[PDB]
Amino acid sequence: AIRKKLVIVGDGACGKTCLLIVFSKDQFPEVYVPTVFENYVADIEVDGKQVELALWDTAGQEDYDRLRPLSYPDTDVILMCFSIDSPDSLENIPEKWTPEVKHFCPNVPIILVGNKKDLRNDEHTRRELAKMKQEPVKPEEGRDMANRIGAFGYMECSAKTKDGVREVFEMATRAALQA
């Protein structure tokens, strides 16, 4: 089992902490959802290759530009997250996060991940977004942004229901394994 490193980046409300928790526990916490994620080493077998994938979060580091890059050394794959119920978190991807991740992690594959896809057909979400003249991110808007920033791929998932979560991390392992 080779060792690879994964770092999740994105705005505070992109749902990156919850994605790391649901993946590591293989369950959406029934009794208590933790506020923080420390670290985890996942045993993943993708395409017949066994990998030890270390998972890291950047939550809490968004306002601290000199503390935050300390999470980047030797990263093998970046999960660049945004929330499907938040068109604003998608806007910050090519402006702030992509130039930072390409400067500290040159040549590292990036997977643009659209979180909270369950809210794309949630009525409370649709009514709330209309007050600010917005609507949920469409799957093609995500694909276009992923193409624009030169991401390795574009994927979607829902931490609430676990749908698409295993595939995100299995594709990250595949990307981390490539030259």
Binding site: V36, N39, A54, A59, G60, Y64, L67, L70
Partner: peptide, 15 residues
Amino acid sequence: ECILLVTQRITKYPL
């Protein structure tokens, strides 16, 4: 891993 755990600790407190 230990070094990054320690560095990340301080930024967990406000959350």
